[PDB]
From a paper:
Mutations in MAPT, the microtubule-associated protein tau gene, give rise to cases of frontotemporal dementia and parkinsonism linked to chromosome 17 (FTDP-17) with abundant filamentous tau inclusions in brain cells. Missense mutations of residue P301, which are the most common MAPT mutations associated with FTDP-17, give rise to the assembly of mutant four-repeat tau into filamentous inclusions, in the absence of extracellular deposits. The other three isoforms lack exon 10 expression and have three repeats (3R). These repeats and adjoining sequences constitute the microtubule-binding domains of tau. Part of this sequence also forms the core of assembled tau in neurodegenerative diseases, indicating that the physiological function of microtubule binding and the pathological assembly into amyloid filaments are mutually exclusive.
Two types of tau filaments, each made of a single protofilament, were present. In type I P301T filaments, the core spans residues G273-R379 of tau and adopts a new fold, in the shape of the letter V. It has a four-layered body and two-layered wings. The N-terminal half of the core sequence (residues 273–324) forms the inner side of the V-shaped fold with a sharp bend at the R2-R3 junction, whereas the C-terminal half (residues 325–379) curves around this bend on the outer side. The conformation of the R2-R3 junction in type I P301T filaments is different from that of type II P301T filaments, but it is almost identical to the conformations of the R2-R3 junction in filaments from mouse lines expressing human tau with mutations P301S or P301L. Missense mutations in P301 stabilise this conformation by creating an additional hydrogen bond to the main chain of an adjacent molecule. The side chain of T301 is on the outside surface of this common substructure and makes a solvent-mediated interaction with residue S352 of R4. The type I P301T fold also displays local similarities with the corticobasal degeneration (CBD) and AGD tau folds by sharing with them the substructures 312–333 in R3 and 337–357 in R4. In all three folds, residues 312–333 form a compact semi-detached unit, whereas residues 337–357 wrap around the R2-R3 junction. However, in the type I P301T filaments, the substructure from R4 makes interactions with the R2-R3 junction that have an inside-out conformation compared to the CBD and AGD folds.
Numbering used by the authors:
A (entry chain C), B (entry chain A), C (entry chain B), D (entry chain D): 273 to 379
The structure:
């Protein structure tokens, strides 16, 4: 006779909580210019096979992102006023619980 | 006789909570110009096969993104006023729970 | 005799909650110009096969996105006023629960 | 005799909640000009096969998107007023639950 609980599990399991606030580029003040380039991706492919006495000129006018600001003139005040700023993050949650029970009762 | 609970699971399982606030480029103040380029993607392909005494000129006028601001003139005040700013994130939730029970009762 | 519970599962399972607020480019103030280019995608293909004494000029007038602002003149005030700003995120939910029971009762 | 519960499932299953607020380009104030280019896609194809002493000029007048603002003049005030702004997100829901039971009762 055999009365068994057998656990031969292969457990590559993931349990994850991400709770609260995640801010990128918050509260950026510029008197003249604010320039932001966020996560540009370039996956361009260029192939150039040149034969005998051949000529290839790969000369695009610019790259992926070009941002330009010029000739800004301010005569009077440039000002920012904030009376109060509160950045509150309260995380009572984000709890992980993993339970595994094996109970064998024999009579 | 055999009375068995057998667990031979292959557990590559994912449990995940993402709870609360995620802000990118929040509260950006510029007196003259705000320029934002967000996640441009370039997957362009160029192929240039040039034969004998051939000529290829690949010369596009610009790249993917060109942003330009010029000749801005302000005589009087340039101002921003905020009386109060509250950024509140409350996360009581986002809880993960994983339970696994094996119960064998024999008479 | 065999009385069995057998679990030979292949569990590549995904359980995920995404709860709350996600803001991109919120509250952007510009006195002169605001220029935003959001997620441009370029999947253009160019093929240029040039024969003997041939000539190819691939010269498009510009790339994908061109944004331009020029010659803006302000004599009097340029102003923004906000009395109060509240950004509140409350996430009591977003809970994940995964339960797996094996119960064998023998008489 | 065989009394069995057999679970040989191949579980590549997806359970996901996305609950709350998702804002892109919210609350953008520009004194002169606001220029927004949102998710332009270019899948253009150009093929140029040039023979002996041939000539190809691929010269389109511009690329996909061209946005231009020029010569704006403001004599008096340019102003924005908001008395109060509330951005409230409340997510009590967005809960995922996955239950799997195996019950074998033998007499």
């Amino acid at each position: 006779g055999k009365v068994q609980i057998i656990n031969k599990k292969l457990d590559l399991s993931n349990v994850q909580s991400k709770c609260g606030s995640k801010d990128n580029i918050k509260h950026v003040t510029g008197g003249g210019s604010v320039q932001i380039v966020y996560k540009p991706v370039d996956l361009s492919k260029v192939t150039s096979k040149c034969g005998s006495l051949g000529n290839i000129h790969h000369k695009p006018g610019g790259g992926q992102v070009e941002v330009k600001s010029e000739k800004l003139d301010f005569k009077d005040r440039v000002q920012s006023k904030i009376g109060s700023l509160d950045n509150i993050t309260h995380v009572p949650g984000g709890g992980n619980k993993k339970i595994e029970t094996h109970k064998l009762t024999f009579r």
